[PDB]
Structures are given as structure tokens and as C-alpha cells.
């Protein structure tokens, strides 16, 4: 699962809500460790 | 990740540090269990 | 690992112990979530 926020600032106003910023509690390549990362996503690729 | 020590057994002194004894809690035949096991390794196969 | 009980509901007595009801902590399709699950099983396919 991802935690997210609406992307804000530096946008055309007709782009509002089209992008979300989200993050992961996903593991490192070592199986015993964890890292936090985040990425830009189109709203179309996610569902609450 | 594995814990290790520089285990010896009447090692010649030009072999020191070439082998390490290390251990981890592995995986088991059932997803719900773990166990600790150790084995010898050549120094070449590991990095701190 | 499975938690289990003998199924005694609605059963002819020469069938006793042929079925067990059991349950487990196996994962949901989300990587970070789990769900309780249970099913009937034939005694032949399980061991203590």
C-alpha cells in the first residue's frame, strides 16, 4: 500500500489532481532491510 | 545479513582471516518459522 | 502453520476425524496485509 498526497505547486490549474505523490515502505534488495522511497504517479494508475 | 567471526581450527598463520564462520535466521519449511544456522565461507564471497 | 479442530457437526460416526477445520495467518494480495483464512481438509493431507 501507498501513502499519498496531491501534487501541488508549479502546475497549470487544469492539471489539478492529475498527479499524486506517494511512498513505499518497500524492502531493500537485502531481504532483511527496509527503505522508504517515493514516486510521481498519474491518478489513473491508482485507486484508493 | 550474516553475523560473522574469524573462526579457526589449528589454522596456519598464512591462512588467517581467509575463512569466516557466519550465521543467519534463514527460512524454514513453514513460512511461520525461522531458525539459526551457520557455515564456513571464503572471505572472497562476502563483504562487510 | 495451521490451527485446527475435529469436525463433529452433522457427521456419521464412522467418519469421525476424517475432516478437520483449520485456519491460518496467510497474506492478502497486498504485500503488507494478512487475513484469517480457514478451510475443511481431509485428514490424509495433513500431519501434526
Amino acid at each position: 500500500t501507498l501513502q499519498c498526497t496531491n501534487v501541488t505547486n508549479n502546475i497549470t490549474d487544469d492539471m489539478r489532481g492529475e498527479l499524486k505523490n506517494c511512498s513505499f515502505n518497500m524492502t531493500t534488495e537485502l531481504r532483511d532491510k527496509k527503505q522508504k522511497v517515493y514516486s510521481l504517479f498519474y491518478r489513473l494508475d491508482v485507486v484508493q | 545479513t550474516l553475523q560473522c567471526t574469524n573462526v579457526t581450527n589449528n589454522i596456519t598463520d598464512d591462512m588467517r582471516g581467509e575463512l569466516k564462520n557466519c550465521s543467519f535466521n534463514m527460512t524454514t519449511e513453514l513460512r511461520d518459522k525461522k531458525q539459526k544456522v551457520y557455515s564456513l565461507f571464503y572471505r572472497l564471497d562476502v563483504v562487510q | 502453520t495451521l490451527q485446527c479442530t475435529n469436525v463433529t457437526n452433522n457427521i456419521t460416526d464412522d467418519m469421525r476425524g476424517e475432516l478437520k477445520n483449520c485456519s491460518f495467518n496467510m497474506t492478502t494480495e497486498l504485500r503488507d496485509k494478512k487475513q484469517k483464512v480457514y478451510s475443511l481438509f481431509y485428514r490424509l493431507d495433513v500431519v501434526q
Partner: antibody
Amino acid sequence: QVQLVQSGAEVKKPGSSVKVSCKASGNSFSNHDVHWVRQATGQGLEWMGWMSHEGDKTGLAQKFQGRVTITRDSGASTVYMELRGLTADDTAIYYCLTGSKHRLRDYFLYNEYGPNYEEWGDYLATLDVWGHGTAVTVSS
Amino acid sequence: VVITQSPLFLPVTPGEAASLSCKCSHSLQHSTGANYLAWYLQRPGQTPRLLIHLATHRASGVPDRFSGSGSGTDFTLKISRVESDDVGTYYCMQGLHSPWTFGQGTKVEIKR
């Protein structure tokens, strides 16, 4: 009722360390949390620190950081605590008590090809029965 | 995380119900729904004894006069029919977050 034993009361000079010990009959420390508590007459209880019944965790109330340690005899039949830097305002009744905890996974990721990533933690549930305690005071 | 308790002390008329409260900066509830709250009584001249625990039950061998309440940041301890042997001080405790802590406590004393 497990018997509990603690060190006799002691007077110590200001600016210096003291040490205490405790015991549980039947080597029941293996099944209980080690705890230390401090109290002053006319004042509320203060947790000092603990050790897990597995012995794989220890800790201190933050007031004691860098002044306290906890050790035990092999096979955990007894436990010890050392206090450092004591001054006259450290006069208190000290206690050793047994305890209980709840260990619950706090986070997980299932892995198809390996052990599940897991996070765990301890929540104290109850204090178990209190030791008779020790008294420690500090004077010239 | 911090803990407080009130009233600092309570005068008591014998044979009458009375209660104590404990509050803290964060809920004592856990994601499992577990609560890590416990109350203790210290008679003077004696070590403390568990009264209730995990915000849900009396400790074994505790009189049934004992009860408690609440959720989240607020909890109470109540004793119906308070008796002179309930004199002493009381402490709420948090096992939910490190370092484990006690409330500042309250004192029960018979009114005079």
C-alpha cells in the same frame, strides 16, 4: 510465589556509583521481565529500567541514560544493576520487580522467496510481584 | 509521551464509592485494539500491588469493589464502598510506549 531477593541498603559518598543485585527463585527470570523502580518518600513511583525475559532487550527511563547498566548471572538466576554518579538527591528506595509483556508484530511484508520482512515490539502488560527492595542513600 | 493523574489526593467518606483518573498525551490503545494501562496501589510501608490491568480487568485476587473506565487518552479507576484499607497511593502505568512510565499518582485518605 517466586522468592525475590535484593541487596541490603547502603550509604554512599556523593558523586559516585552504587551497585545492586537481585534474585528470583527457581530461575524464573527466564519467564519474567526484569525491572528496576525508584521511589522517594512522599513521591510517586519512577520506572528505572528493564530487561526482557528473553534477555534480548534492555532499557532505561531517559533520566538515567549514561548512568545505569543491567547485567545478569549466566542462566539468568540473578540480575544486577549499577547506578553511577549518585548524589544526595538520589536517596531513594530502589526496587527489583518481576514483570510481563506482550510481544506483537508491528509490521510485516510477506516474502514469496524468503522470510517475511518483520518488525516487532514489546508492550509492558503488568508488573509482577515486587521485590522487598533496597534502600540507597548518599551522604558525606 | 506524558502522563498525569487527578485529584492529587482525595479525602474519603468510608463506605462510599470514589474514583481516580489518569490522562496522557496519546492513546493507550494499540493497533490490535489492546490497551496498555494498569493501576497499582501502594499501602504505606509496603510495595505497590496491581489493581487492574490492560484497562480491562481486575488483577486476580482484587476485591470486586474495583472497576475502571475510558478509552484513548482518558482512563479512570473506581472503587465502590471505599474502606480505610484502601488508603495509600495509586499509580496508573503505561506499557504502550518506551520508556515505560507511571502517572504522578494520587493519594486516597479518609476524610477528617
